[PDB]
Structure 1
Amino acid sequence: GQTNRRHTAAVPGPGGIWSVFHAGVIGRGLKPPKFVQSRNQQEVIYNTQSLLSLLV
């Protein structure tokens, strides 16, 4: 086992006369992938069994 249209439709700090509330971003934030290894439990130990049999 193991871009700007949306930023424009909600801009101007809802006032159209001042700057933004925040002061910028640090990196990217809210990492998209966030994937966890959940392939399978069964039929995984049998591959290890076949590999050990080949090695034997």
Structure 2
Amino acid sequence: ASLLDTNRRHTAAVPGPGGIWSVFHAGVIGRGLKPPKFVQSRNQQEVIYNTQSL
């Protein structure tokens, strides 16, 4: 629904300079916003004893 949502965002807040609306931005850098890339860490004790087994 990327284009559907984009069409929703195109609702003009003001009527426009001459009754015709143009989008504010000149484009999008890259593929938009980057993902947050959330990290994950396991238990440190289990890491210690996995290292111990190895």
In structure 1, distance between residues paired with 2:49 and 2:37:
28
Q: Which consecutive aligned stretches of 4+ in structure 1 deviate over 4 angstroms post-superposition?
A: 2-16
Q: Which of 1 and 2 has higher RCO (CA within 8 Å, sep 6+)?
A: 1
Normalized per residue, the structure richer in helix is: 2
Give the alignment partner of residue 36 of structure 1, picking from 31, 36, 39.
39
In structure 2, distance between residues paired with 1:48 and 1:5:
53
User: What is the root-mean-square deviation of aligned Cα atoms in Å?
Assistant: 6.1
Structure 1 residues 39 and 25, CA, compared in 2 at 3 Å: closer, same or farther?
same
Which runs of 5 or more structure 2 residues have no equivalent in the other structure? none
Contact 1:12 1:18 in 2 (8 A): yes
